């Protein structure tokens, strides 16, 4: 049976396969972002485990789904790096110089637009 070398102990529950070796679930964590739940097909580097996103980070910042190479200015949000201008609501489409990054429905939003969305459950007079 498989044995967790990280704690030199036996493995009863689900065993994770890495570097042709067996490791425990609680003893197995991404050494890059350290926060996995249940991905599929990860890349190995230097005997380490990196998420799909971490793999790209090692090379360069890329938009989740806009472009490849990101200019100088960049913004790290949702564990992913996206362009500075890409950070805009699908309605305003314009950036709102403020500072912190706002996340909404897995997409970038403005400070006023972000709070305005949480203001009401469905809609309201303002907006
Ligand atoms: Zn272990
Ligand atoms: Zn990771
Ligand atoms: Zn982008
Ligand atoms: Zn906006």
Swiss-Prot record:
Phosphoserine: modified positions: 120
Transmembrane segments: none
Record's subcellular location: Cytoplasm, Cytoskeleton; Cell junction, Focal adhesion; Cytoplasm, Cell cortex
Record's comment on post-translational modification: Phosphorylated by MAPK1/ERK2. Phosphorylated on tyrosine residues during integrin-mediated cell adhesion, embryonic development, fibroblast transformation and following stimulation of cells by mitogens.
Domain of life per record: Eukaryota
Domain LIM zinc-binding: 3-60, 61-120
Quaternary structure, from the entry: Interacts in vitro with VCL/vinculin as well as to the SH3 domain of SRC and, when tyrosine phosphorylated, to the SH2 domain of CRK. Interacts with GIT1. Interacts with NUDT16L1/SDOS. Interacts with PTK2/FAK1. Interacts with PTK2B/PYK2. Interacts with ASAP2. Interacts with unphosphorylated ITGA4. Interacts with RNF5. Interacts with PDCD10. Interacts with NEK3, the interaction is prolactin-dependent. Interacts with PTK6. Interacts with TGFB1I1. Interacts with SORBS1. Interacts with PARVB. Interacts (via LD motif 4) with PARVA/PARVIN. Interacts (via LD motif 4) with ILK.
Entry similarity comment: Belongs to the paxillin family.
Described function: Cytoskeletal protein involved in actin-membrane attachment at sites of cell adhesion to the extracellular matrix (focal adhesion). Recruits other proteins such as TRIM15 to focal adhesion.
Record-given protein name: Paxillin
The species this protein was found in: Homo sapiens (Human)
Recorded name of the encoding gene: PXN
From-to range in the entire protein, with total length: 414 to 533 of 591
């Amino acid at each position: 049976s498989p044995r967790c070398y990280y704690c030199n102990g036996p493995i009863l529950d689900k065993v994770v396969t890495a570097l042709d070796r067996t490791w425990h679930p609680e003893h197995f964590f991404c050494a890059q972002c350290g926060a996995f739940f249940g991905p599929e097909g990860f890349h190995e580097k230097d005997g380490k485990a990196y998420c799909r996103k971490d793999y790209f980070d090692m090379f360069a910042p890329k938009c989740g789904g806009c472009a490849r190479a990101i200019l100088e200015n960049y913004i790290s949000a949702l564990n992913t790096l996206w362009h500075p201008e890409c950070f805009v609501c699908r309605e305003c489409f314009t950036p709102f110089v403020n500072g912190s990054f706002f996340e909404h429905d897995g997409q970038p939003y403005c400070e006023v637009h972000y709070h305005e969305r949480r203001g009401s459950p469905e809609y309201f007079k303002n907006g």
